[PDB]
Amino acid sequence: DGTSQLAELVDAAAERLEVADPVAAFKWRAQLPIEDSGRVEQQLAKLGEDARSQHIDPDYVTRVFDDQIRATEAIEYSRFSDWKLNPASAPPEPPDLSASRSAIDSLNNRMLSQIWSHWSLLSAPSCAAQLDRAKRDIVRSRHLDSLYQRALTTATQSYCQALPPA
Amino acid sequence: TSQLAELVDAAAERLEVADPVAAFKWRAQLPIEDSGRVEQQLAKLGEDARSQHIDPDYVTRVFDDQIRATEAIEYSRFSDWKLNPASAPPEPPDLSASRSAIDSLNNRMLSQIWSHWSLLSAPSCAAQLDRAKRDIVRSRHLDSLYQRALTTATQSYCQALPPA
């Protein structure tokens, strides 16, 4: 018709990337740095726990969300670069992070549910092409720009599992 | 050729040091920002301007723009390296080396500003600066990021006031 079986997963991933914008605007005003390794380690440990809860491979989930979070931090740093050149262009008085936190919790759960439901595909030779189809379709539907296209690539780079070498 | 070409070329050269500075910070997991240091850096420059009877408020404004643009580049490189960490340079000159390169560039810049004071404070400055930017963008083959950074770095040049 024709939709990728991975479209829902990729669409969630891209929507979760888009939380980079309110988070960066908030951090910019609050004079907070983008990165925090201790924080990310905590987020990833909780995601591993959520994986075990739905009998999903936690090491796999850790790798995938490690990619996702780096890709999100990459968007935040690009904004900081822009706002450093033209500070007038930074969103003024932005709201706190509660909506963002709620959106991330929901999207995390959406992503895990899709990992569970498409585990066979993610383990199969057809994964690579079906991921490329899903990416094409979501870049179109969400109208993602150059920066978000690179970020979506980075976010999804560990989705397709390695196959037997013989 | 624009009379501000050497000044703009120096500024562009100094912007290029953002790469090894960022690379070093990436490896050592040091923060890009350093408000304490920046405000100190500008103090040294303001003093050098004063000893040479060059308008210190002007010089401080210019280097503040320059430093802002350098930070913007460091942020953009961190974005790139988060997307693709394999592309981050593995050695990086010591921060000490890069900072010494910057210090020499500061001196060269301040010397060029004093030398071209008559043009910087003249109505033709905007025209000559746009000309110098076009030329250096060409000669150094500056990408979209460095073009924007050079604009930011040089945005206060033509604010110079003529003497006496």
Coordinates of C-alpha atoms in Angstrom, one line a residue:
Chain A
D1 CA 0.0 0.0 0.0
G2 CA 2.8 0.2 1.1
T3 CA 4.0 0.8 4.6
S4 CA 7.1 -0.6 6.4
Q5 CA 6.5 -2.9 9.3
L6 CA 9.1 -0.7 11.1
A7 CA 7.2 2.6 10.4
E8 CA 5.6 2.8 13.9
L9 CA 9.0 2.2 15.6
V10 CA 10.8 4.7 13.4
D11 CA 8.0 7.3 13.7
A12 CA 8.3 7.0 17.6
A13 CA 12.0 7.4 17.3
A14 CA 11.7 10.5 15.2
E15 CA 9.0 12.0 17.5
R16 CA 11.4 11.3 20.5
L17 CA 14.2 13.1 18.6
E18 CA 11.9 16.1 18.3
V19 CA 12.0 16.5 22.2
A20 CA 15.5 17.8 21.7
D21 CA 14.1 21.2 20.8
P22 CA 12.2 22.1 24.0
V23 CA 14.9 20.4 26.0
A24 CA 17.7 22.5 24.4
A25 CA 15.6 25.8 24.7
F26 CA 15.2 25.1 28.4
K27 CA 18.9 24.2 28.9
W28 CA 20.0 27.3 27.0
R29 CA 17.9 29.7 29.2
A30 CA 18.8 27.8 32.4
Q31 CA 22.6 27.8 31.6
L32 CA 22.7 24.0 31.8
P33 CA 25.1 21.9 29.7
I34 CA 23.8 19.4 27.2
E35 CA 25.6 16.3 28.4
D36 CA 25.7 14.4 31.6
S37 CA 27.2 10.9 31.6
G38 CA 25.8 10.0 35.0
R39 CA 22.3 10.9 34.0
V40 CA 22.4 9.0 30.7
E41 CA 23.7 5.9 32.5
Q42 CA 20.7 6.1 34.8
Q43 CA 18.3 6.5 31.9
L44 CA 19.8 3.6 30.1
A45 CA 19.8 1.3 33.2
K46 CA 16.0 2.0 33.6
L47 CA 15.4 1.2 30.0
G48 CA 17.3 -2.1 30.5
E49 CA 14.9 -2.8 33.4
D50 CA 11.9 -2.0 31.3
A51 CA 13.3 -4.3 28.6
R52 CA 13.5 -7.3 31.1
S53 CA 9.9 -6.5 32.2
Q54 CA 8.6 -7.3 28.7
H55 CA 11.1 -10.1 28.0
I56 CA 13.0 -8.0 25.5
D57 CA 16.8 -8.4 25.2
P58 CA 18.1 -5.6 27.5
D59 CA 21.6 -5.4 25.9
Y60 CA 19.9 -4.8 22.5
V61 CA 17.7 -2.0 24.1
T62 CA 20.7 -0.4 25.8
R63 CA 22.6 -0.2 22.5
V64 CA 19.6 1.2 20.6
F65 CA 18.8 3.9 23.2
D66 CA 22.5 4.8 23.5
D67 CA 22.3 5.7 19.8
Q68 CA 18.9 7.5 20.3
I69 CA 20.2 9.6 23.2
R70 CA 23.5 10.6 21.4
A71 CA 21.4 11.5 18.3
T72 CA 19.2 13.7 20.5
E73 CA 22.2 15.4 22.2
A74 CA 23.6 16.0 18.7
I75 CA 20.4 18.0 17.8
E76 CA 20.7 20.0 21.1
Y77 CA 24.4 20.9 20.4
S78 CA 23.4 22.1 16.8
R79 CA 20.8 24.4 18.4
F80 CA 23.4 25.7 20.9
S81 CA 25.7 26.4 18.0
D82 CA 23.0 28.4 16.2
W83 CA 22.0 30.3 19.4
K84 CA 25.6 31.2 20.1
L85 CA 25.9 32.9 16.7
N86 CA 22.4 34.6 17.0
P87 CA 21.2 34.5 20.6
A88 CA 18.1 36.6 19.7
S89 CA 17.0 33.5 17.9
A90 CA 16.8 31.3 21.0
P91 CA 13.2 30.6 22.2
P92 CA 12.5 33.2 25.0
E93 CA 10.9 32.2 28.4
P94 CA 10.6 28.5 27.4
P95 CA 8.4 26.2 29.7
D96 CA 9.8 23.6 32.2
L97 CA 10.6 20.0 31.2
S98 CA 7.5 18.2 32.5
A99 CA 5.7 17.8 29.2
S100 CA 9.0 16.6 27.7
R101 CA 9.5 14.1 30.5
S102 CA 6.0 12.7 30.0
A103 CA 6.4 12.6 26.1
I104 CA 9.7 10.6 26.5
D105 CA 8.2 8.1 28.9
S106 CA 5.3 7.4 26.5
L107 CA 7.6 7.2 23.5
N108 CA 10.1 4.9 25.3
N109 CA 7.2 2.5 26.0
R110 CA 6.0 2.8 22.3
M111 CA 9.5 1.9 21.1
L112 CA 9.9 -1.1 23.3
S113 CA 6.4 -2.4 22.3
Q114 CA 7.5 -2.2 18.6
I115 CA 10.8 -3.9 19.3
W116 CA 8.9 -6.7 20.9
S117 CA 6.3 -7.0 18.1
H118 CA 9.0 -6.9 15.3
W119 CA 11.8 -8.9 16.9
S120 CA 11.8 -11.5 14.0
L121 CA 12.2 -8.7 11.4
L122 CA 14.9 -6.9 13.4
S123 CA 16.8 -10.2 13.4
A124 CA 16.3 -10.9 9.7
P125 CA 18.2 -10.2 6.5
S126 CA 15.2 -8.0 5.3
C127 CA 15.7 -5.6 8.2
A128 CA 18.1 -3.3 6.5
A129 CA 15.8 -2.6 3.5
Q130 CA 12.7 -2.3 5.6
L131 CA 14.4 0.2 7.9
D132 CA 15.5 2.2 4.8
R133 CA 11.8 2.2 3.6
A134 CA 10.5 3.2 7.1
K135 CA 13.1 6.0 7.3
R136 CA 12.1 7.3 3.8
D137 CA 8.4 7.3 4.8
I138 CA 8.9 9.1 8.2
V139 CA 11.3 11.7 6.8
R140 CA 8.4 12.5 4.4
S141 CA 5.5 12.3 6.8
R142 CA 7.3 14.3 9.6
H143 CA 9.0 16.6 7.1
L144 CA 12.4 16.0 8.7
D145 CA 15.2 18.4 7.7
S146 CA 18.9 17.6 7.0
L147 CA 19.9 17.7 10.7
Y148 CA 17.0 15.4 11.8
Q149 CA 17.7 13.1 8.9
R150 CA 21.3 12.6 10.1
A151 CA 20.0 12.2 13.7
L152 CA 17.4 9.5 12.6
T153 CA 20.2 7.6 10.9
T154 CA 22.3 7.7 14.0
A155 CA 19.3 6.7 16.2
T156 CA 18.4 3.7 14.1
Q157 CA 21.9 2.4 13.3
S158 CA 21.8 -0.6 15.7
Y159 CA 18.2 -1.7 14.9
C160 CA 19.2 -4.4 12.5
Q161 CA 20.9 -7.4 14.2
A162 CA 23.9 -9.1 12.8
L163 CA 23.2 -12.3 10.8
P164 CA 25.0 -15.7 10.9
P165 CA 28.2 -15.4 8.9
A166 CA 27.6 -18.8 7.3
Chain B
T1 CA 42.0 43.2 -2.9
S2 CA 40.4 44.6 0.3
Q3 CA 42.6 46.5 2.8
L4 CA 40.9 44.4 5.6
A5 CA 41.8 41.1 3.9
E6 CA 44.8 40.3 6.3
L7 CA 42.6 41.1 9.3
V8 CA 39.7 38.9 8.1
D9 CA 42.2 36.2 7.1
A10 CA 43.7 36.3 10.7
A11 CA 40.2 36.1 12.2
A12 CA 39.3 33.1 9.9
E13 CA 42.7 31.4 10.9
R14 CA 41.8 31.9 14.5
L15 CA 38.3 30.4 14.0
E16 CA 40.0 27.3 12.6
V17 CA 41.7 26.7 16.0
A18 CA 38.2 25.8 17.3
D19 CA 38.6 22.4 15.7
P20 CA 41.6 21.2 17.7
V21 CA 40.3 23.0 20.8
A22 CA 36.9 21.1 20.4
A23 CA 38.8 17.8 19.6
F24 CA 40.8 18.1 22.8
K25 CA 37.8 18.9 24.9
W26 CA 35.9 16.0 23.4
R27 CA 38.6 13.5 24.4
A28 CA 39.1 14.9 27.9
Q29 CA 35.3 15.3 28.5
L30 CA 35.8 19.0 29.3
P31 CA 33.0 21.6 28.9
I32 CA 32.8 23.9 25.9
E33 CA 31.8 26.9 28.1
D34 CA 34.2 28.6 30.5
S35 CA 32.8 32.0 31.5
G36 CA 35.6 32.6 34.1
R37 CA 38.3 32.2 31.4
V38 CA 36.5 34.2 28.7
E39 CA 36.1 37.2 30.9
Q40 CA 39.8 36.9 31.9
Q41 CA 40.9 36.5 28.2
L42 CA 39.1 39.8 27.3
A43 CA 40.9 41.6 30.2
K44 CA 44.3 40.8 28.8
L45 CA 43.2 42.1 25.4
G46 CA 41.7 45.3 26.8
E47 CA 45.0 46.0 28.6
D48 CA 47.1 45.4 25.4
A49 CA 44.7 47.8 23.6
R50 CA 45.2 50.4 26.4
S51 CA 49.0 50.2 26.4
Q52 CA 49.0 50.9 22.6
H53 CA 46.4 53.7 23.0
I54 CA 43.8 51.6 21.0
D55 CA 40.1 52.0 22.1
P56 CA 39.6 49.2 24.6
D57 CA 35.8 49.0 24.5
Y58 CA 36.0 48.4 20.8
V59 CA 38.7 45.8 21.1
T60 CA 36.8 44.0 23.8
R61 CA 33.6 43.9 21.7
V62 CA 35.4 42.5 18.7
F63 CA 37.1 39.7 20.6
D64 CA 33.9 38.9 22.4
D65 CA 32.3 38.3 18.9
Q66 CA 35.4 36.3 17.9
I67 CA 35.2 34.1 21.0
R68 CA 31.4 33.6 20.6
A69 CA 32.0 32.4 17.0
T70 CA 34.7 30.0 18.2
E71 CA 32.3 28.5 20.8
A72 CA 29.7 28.2 18.1
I73 CA 32.1 26.1 16.0
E74 CA 33.0 23.9 19.0
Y75 CA 29.2 23.2 19.6
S76 CA 28.7 22.3 15.9
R77 CA 31.7 19.9 16.0
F78 CA 30.3 18.2 19.2
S79 CA 27.0 17.8 17.3
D80 CA 28.9 16.1 14.4
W81 CA 30.8 13.8 16.7
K82 CA 27.7 12.7 18.6
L83 CA 26.2 11.7 15.2
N84 CA 29.5 10.1 14.2
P85 CA 32.1 9.7 17.0
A86 CA 34.5 7.9 14.5
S87 CA 35.1 11.3 12.8
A88 CA 36.4 13.0 15.9
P89 CA 40.2 13.6 15.6
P90 CA 42.1 11.1 17.9
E91 CA 45.1 13.5 18.6
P92 CA 44.5 16.9 19.1
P93 CA 47.4 19.2 20.0
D94 CA 47.5 20.0 23.7
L95 CA 45.1 22.7 24.8
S96 CA 48.3 24.6 25.8
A97 CA 49.5 24.5 22.1
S98 CA 46.1 25.7 20.7
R99 CA 46.0 28.5 23.3
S100 CA 49.5 29.6 22.3
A101 CA 48.5 29.6 18.6
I102 CA 45.4 31.8 19.6
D103 CA 47.6 34.1 21.7
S104 CA 49.8 34.8 18.7
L105 CA 46.7 35.4 16.5
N106 CA 45.3 37.8 19.1
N107 CA 48.5 39.9 18.8
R108 CA 48.4 39.8 15.0
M109 CA 44.7 40.8 15.0
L110 CA 45.3 43.7 17.4
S111 CA 48.2 44.9 15.2
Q112 CA 46.0 44.7 12.1
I113 CA 43.2 46.6 13.8
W114 CA 45.5 49.4 14.9
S115 CA 47.1 49.5 11.4
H116 CA 43.7 49.8 9.6
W117 CA 42.1 52.1 12.1
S118 CA 41.5 54.8 9.5
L119 CA 39.5 52.3 7.3
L120 CA 37.7 50.6 10.1
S121 CA 36.4 54.0 11.3
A122 CA 35.5 55.2 7.7
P123 CA 32.2 55.0 5.8
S124 CA 33.8 52.6 3.4
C125 CA 34.4 50.0 6.1
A126 CA 31.1 48.0 5.4
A127 CA 32.0 47.7 1.7
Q128 CA 35.6 46.7 2.3
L129 CA 34.6 44.2 5.0
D130 CA 32.1 42.5 2.8
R131 CA 34.8 42.4 0.1
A132 CA 37.4 40.9 2.4
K133 CA 34.9 38.3 3.7
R134 CA 34.0 37.2 0.1
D135 CA 37.7 36.8 -0.7
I136 CA 38.7 34.9 2.5
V137 CA 35.6 32.6 2.2
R138 CA 37.1 31.8 -1.3
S139 CA 40.7 31.5 -0.4
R140 CA 40.2 29.4 2.7
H141 CA 37.3 27.5 1.1
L142 CA 35.1 28.1 4.1
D143 CA 32.0 25.9 4.5
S144 CA 28.5 27.2 5.6
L145 CA 29.3 26.9 9.3
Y146 CA 32.6 28.9 9.0
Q147 CA 30.9 31.5 6.7
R148 CA 28.3 32.2 9.5
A149 CA 31.0 32.1 12.2
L150 CA 33.1 34.7 10.2
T151 CA 30.1 37.0 9.9
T152 CA 29.6 36.8 13.7
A153 CA 33.3 37.3 14.4
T154 CA 33.5 40.5 12.3
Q155 CA 30.0 41.9 13.0
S156 CA 31.4 44.8 15.2
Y157 CA 34.4 45.7 12.9
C158 CA 32.9 48.9 11.4
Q159 CA 32.0 50.4 14.8
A160 CA 35.4 51.9 15.2
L161 CA 35.4 55.7 15.9
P162 CA 37.9 58.0 14.0
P163 CA 40.4 60.0 16.2
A164 CA 41.0 63.6 17.5

